[PDB]
Amino acid sequence: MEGVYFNIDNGFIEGVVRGYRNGLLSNNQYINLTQCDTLEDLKLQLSSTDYGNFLSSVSSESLTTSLIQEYASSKLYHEFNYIRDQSSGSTRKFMDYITYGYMIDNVALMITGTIHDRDKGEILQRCHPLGWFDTLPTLSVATDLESLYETVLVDTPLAPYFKNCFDTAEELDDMNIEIIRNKLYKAYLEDFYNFVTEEIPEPAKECMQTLLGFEADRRSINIALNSLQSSDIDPDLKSDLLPNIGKLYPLATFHLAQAQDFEGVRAALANVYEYRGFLETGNLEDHFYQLEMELCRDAFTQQFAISTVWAWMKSKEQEVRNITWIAECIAQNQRERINNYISVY
Amino acid sequence: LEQILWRVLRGNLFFKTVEIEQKNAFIVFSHGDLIIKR
Amino acid sequence: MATALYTANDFILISLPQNAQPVTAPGSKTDSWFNETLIGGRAFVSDFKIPEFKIGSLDTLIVESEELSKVDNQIGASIGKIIEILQGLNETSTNAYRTLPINNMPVPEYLENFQWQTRKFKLDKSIKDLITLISNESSQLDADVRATYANYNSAKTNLAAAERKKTGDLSVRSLHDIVKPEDFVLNSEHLTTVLVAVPKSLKSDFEKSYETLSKNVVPASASVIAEDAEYVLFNVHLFKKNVQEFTTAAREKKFIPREFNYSEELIDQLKKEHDSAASLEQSLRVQLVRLAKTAYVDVFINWFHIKALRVYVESVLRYGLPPHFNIKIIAVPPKNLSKCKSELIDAFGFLGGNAFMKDKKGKINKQDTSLHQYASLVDTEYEPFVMYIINL
Amino acid sequence: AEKRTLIAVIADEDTTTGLLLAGIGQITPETQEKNFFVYQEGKTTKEEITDKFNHFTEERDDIAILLINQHIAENIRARVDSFTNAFPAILEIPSKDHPYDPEKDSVLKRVRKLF
Amino acid sequence: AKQKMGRVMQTAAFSLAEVSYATGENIGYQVQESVSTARFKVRARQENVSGVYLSQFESYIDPEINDFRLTGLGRGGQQVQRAKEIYSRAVETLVELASLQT
């Protein structure tokens, strides 16, 4: 409903997130940036965004490799640490779990990579509000479940890696970052439905349920398509099968994902999606990005709710990859393949 | 199940017999002299 | 069932010996038991027998049966791929090309008159070379329609790439269809042509700030020479040295600068690329339609001959003695193959054995595993006699 | 006869990551030493590239062709120009974000003299 | 062949650098840690039509050697798998073009 909630904490974070969300790359800037092939036309459209402040300070016409990583790291750190540092209450505490869930995937791969005997001297942050030297090196250096639970217990609130460490303590899911990443993606998908069901009374959310259901179905279809041709075990949980809409069964997703190759769950889930009968990874990769990009601009119309900040925090992952692919492709003198096929932003 | 798999993968070109042993089971099949490899 | 069956009739291919009889009618022929004892009295029986081929031994018959089953499954998938490729072009509906006369004759009349007649096949050669030649001809016929569909998709992608240069948003498009000798002068090094894309709200700001946007400009050039759906196109003439200051003031004014140069070869190649892509896609669709129709007809005839040879090899390998048997095709109506399959399987199930007979009806296929095919090399359903399910 | 199946790679992290993802090299478990050396932009020195090229050139016999970039090969042009044996062969290719140069080819200098 | 191999290596390095920069994580550490076998190998053969002996190379791919476990992280897994397949497809033509140097 509307007119019954007076949360000033969501109104302050909605205005602080709306101030950075106002001067951002919209769908017209991405459509004009994808069709553009000039340095002045590409730098002029991307220069008016939040990531274009570094291009305004340091003027350039050709996008470099280190400049896109430094501008994307400063844009993500300024868009995440600035909004997270200025928020308080249940809005900041609930907003910290979204960054902790995104940083838990890199923290689990760094923790498994530390026991895997791999080199590590630089780690990029996508949506993690904490740096890779304060919280990531302590959890990555520790290899025991008692030290990971003790280090996870010091943080407030608890991160999602405690349940993955508790499930992985008995050796019930996998001994790699693949099955722990799929089970962590399924538990992260269930945590959004639990938080959306818990916050359904005070805040009114309608676009967050459709964006969470479409992002959960596209994340389950992308997780099932990612385990295809990769030697996925049928007994272990690796396809991310779970009920989130009502038209996706676990036997159809895991059976069609593992060794069956049955795209009936895509057409049975919906007919307005980009891929419902396709079987190629190239068209399914652009169709999953076009389906995940939808429900983002329409969710930004409503204000005074965390559903707009939930899709706005998830839009920076596709916007950073689209801006990095468009800036690297246009700066590298080449044509975009995944960015040219996508039209929904 | 071996007779069902042999009948499903080779048709009716075999013999289905069973003999009680001391546990074990005595089986015997009959076919051509040139189909010993198959 | 089938991926291309919408309103087509179903047929069941059965094979039995010439001295067999049913279990529900002792002392009666199989033709009278199929015609009179059929479910509902509307069962249509047609001849499906063919001439016998030279057999060397059972070892070559087993490998010919496995290669005939794999070539029958590959021809069945190749027929559905050409049927889906022909249905995707919008040249055949869900009630045409599945229930109409194919090969200039009906499905029951052409199937009843199919006595192993070919124009490139013989009756004294090996069946393995004819089945492999038919499977290679159907695979090449489906590969030709797939290559024609890929070339039509590439021509449609080239036409879609030329459509962005032909019109749309002024970000990659260049004016090559509205250029004249009175709006763009590039005959000397003093004057040049620079395009500036401005919005509808910023038209007065670009028209008023056009004189102060750069030094050495040409007045009276504020006109709508081109129009878009997100911005307006304006023409401005100035020196080449002032393009950096005009582009800097245009970028500071929140405008969209366009890099365009006066050249007839760019507009001629830009129009010739879209015309060649449109003519190439238009010829590729017309060639792909007839190639898909001829590949569908040749894949249908090769699928029918491969199905008859696979049914004869499966009946000869599964039956043993005698070498000759009664092979016919029974035409069933739509949504009636379960009763004829359960009655024919229950009636003819006692011929093979009482331990390998089970109740089954219809044909249920799956994406993970195609069932009800009677495969002799992979795990699938099996019956006492030769039984094949064909869904048109 | 065939006595080498692995290929050495000495390039940037993008080309070395694509070549390692393609499966041209691997890590032998007999000594726990990889068959490739990643070149960090500004992090590695010329002594590690010359030690890795010297260890992969004569210290190993399973390397069929030794890959080297034009930018990384310029700092090792003395040791790369001094090595002219075909076992393993040295193929100078263009580096990432760099154009083709005829002066960065050791085979072109010896092939140019007395051609 | 050195110019075409340099152009194809520049395109494959640009696509792998675009996929690695778009992934947002160190893909080289996970690819180097998960890489313990050689999927694409070469065969040394003696094909000499001349006064002396020549060295030839033939590209071979193992059928049991599947794709490396580097996918399954959401959107970056499909781009890493397609970048690995395009990197191997460019690496086969790069080795086949660079085989004549010996």
Curated annotation (Swiss-Prot), chain A:
The keyword Electron transport does not apply. Keywords: Acetylation, Hydrogen ion transport, Ion transport, Membrane, Transport, Vacuole. The modification N-acetylmethionine is found at M1. One of its GO terms (molecular function) is proton-transporting ATPase activity, rotational mechanism. It is a peripheral membrane protein. It comes from the Eukaryota. It is found in: Vacuole membrane. Its main location: membrane. GO terms for biological process: endosomal lumen acidification; Golgi lumen acidification; proton transmembrane transport; vacuolar acidification; vacuolar transport. One of its GO terms (cellular component) is proton-transporting V-type ATPase complex. Belongs to the V-ATPase V0D/AC39 subunit family. Subunit of the V0 complex of vacuolar(H+)-ATPase (V-ATPase), a multisubunit enzyme composed of a peripheral complex (V1) that hydrolyzes ATP and a membrane integral complex (V0) that translocates protons. V-ATPase is responsible for acidifying and maintaining the pH of intracellular compartments. This subunit is a non-integral membrane component of the membrane pore domain and is required for proper assembly of the V0 sector. Might be involved in the regulated assembly of V1 subunits onto the membrane sector or alternatively may prevent the passage of protons through V0 pores. PANTHER family: VACUOLAR ATP SYNTHASE SUBUNIT AC39. Present with 1630 molecules/cell in log phase SD medium. This is V-type proton ATPase subunit d. It comes from Saccharomyces cerevisiae (strain ATCC 204508 / S288c). The lineage of its organism: Eukaryota, Fungi, Dikarya, Ascomycota, Saccharomycotina. The gene is VMA6.
UniProtKB/Swiss-Prot annotation, chain B:
V-ATPase is a heteromultimeric enzyme composed of a peripheral catalytic V1 complex (components A to H) attached to an integral membrane V0 proton pore complex (components: a, c, c', c'', d, e, f and VOA1). This is V-type proton ATPase subunit a, vacuolar isoform. Present with 55714 molecules/cell in log phase SD medium. Glycosylated. Subunit of the V0 complex of vacuolar(H+)-ATPase (V-ATPase), a multisubunit enzyme composed of a peripheral complex (V1) that hydrolyzes ATP and a membrane integral complex (V0) that translocates protons. V-ATPase is responsible for acidifying and maintaining the pH of intracellular compartments. Is present only in vacuolar V-ATPase complexes; enzymes containing this subunit have a 4-fold higher ratio of proton transport to ATP hydrolysis than complexes containing the Golgi/endosomal isoform and undergo reversible dissociation of V1 and V0 in response to glucose depletion. It is found in: Vacuole membrane. Disulfide bonds: none annotated. Signal peptide: none annotated. Belongs to the V-ATPase 116 kDa subunit family.
Swiss-Prot record, chain D:
It is a peripheral membrane protein. It comes from the Eukaryota. One of its GO terms (cellular component) is fungal-type vacuole membrane. It is found in: Vacuole membrane. InterPro entries: ATPase_V1-cplx_f_g_su (IPR008218), ATPase_V1-cplx_fsu_euk (IPR005772), ATPase_V1_fsu_sf (IPR036906). Pfam families: ATP-synt_F. GO terms for molecular function: proton-transporting ATPase activity, rotational mechanism. Its main location: membrane. One of its GO terms (biological process) is vacuolar acidification. Coiled coil: none annotated. Signal peptide: none annotated. Keywords: Hydrogen ion transport, Ion transport, Membrane, Transport, Vacuole. V-ATPase is a heteromultimeric enzyme composed of a peripheral catalytic V1 complex (components A to H) attached to an integral membrane V0 proton pore complex (components: a, c, c', c'', d, e, f and VOA1). Belongs to the V-ATPase F subunit family. Present with 4050 molecules/cell in log phase SD medium. Subunit of the V1 complex of vacuolar(H+)-ATPase (V-ATPase), a multisubunit enzyme composed of a peripheral complex (V1) that hydrolyzes ATP and a membrane integral complex (V0) that translocates protons. V-ATPase is responsible for acidifying and maintaining the pH of intracellular compartments. This is V-type proton ATPase subunit F.
UniProtKB/Swiss-Prot annotation, chain E:
GO terms for molecular function: proton-transporting ATPase activity, rotational mechanism. It is found in: Vacuole membrane. Keywords: Hydrogen ion transport, Ion transport, Membrane, Transport, Vacuole. Its main location: membrane. GO terms for cellular component: fungal-type vacuole membrane; Golgi membrane; membrane raft; proton-transporting V-type ATPase complex; vacuolar proton-transporting V-type ATPase complex; vacuolar proton-transporting V-type ATPase, V1 domain. One of its GO terms (biological process) is vacuolar acidification. V-ATPase is a heteromultimeric enzyme composed of a peripheral catalytic V1 complex (components A to H) attached to an integral membrane V0 proton pore complex (components: a, c, c', c'', d, e, f and VOA1). Interacts with RAV1 and RAV2 components of the RAVE complex, which are essential for the stability and assembly of V-ATPase. Subunit of the V1 complex of vacuolar(H+)-ATPase (V-ATPase), a multisubunit enzyme composed of a peripheral complex (V1) that hydrolyzes ATP and a membrane integral complex (V0) that translocates protons. V-ATPase is responsible for acidifying and maintaining the pH of intracellular compartments. Belongs to the V-ATPase D subunit family. Present with 8500 molecules/cell in log phase SD medium. This is V-type proton ATPase subunit D. It comes from Saccharomyces cerevisiae (strain ATCC 204508 / S288c) (Baker's yeast). The chain holds residues 53 to 154 of 256 of the full protein.
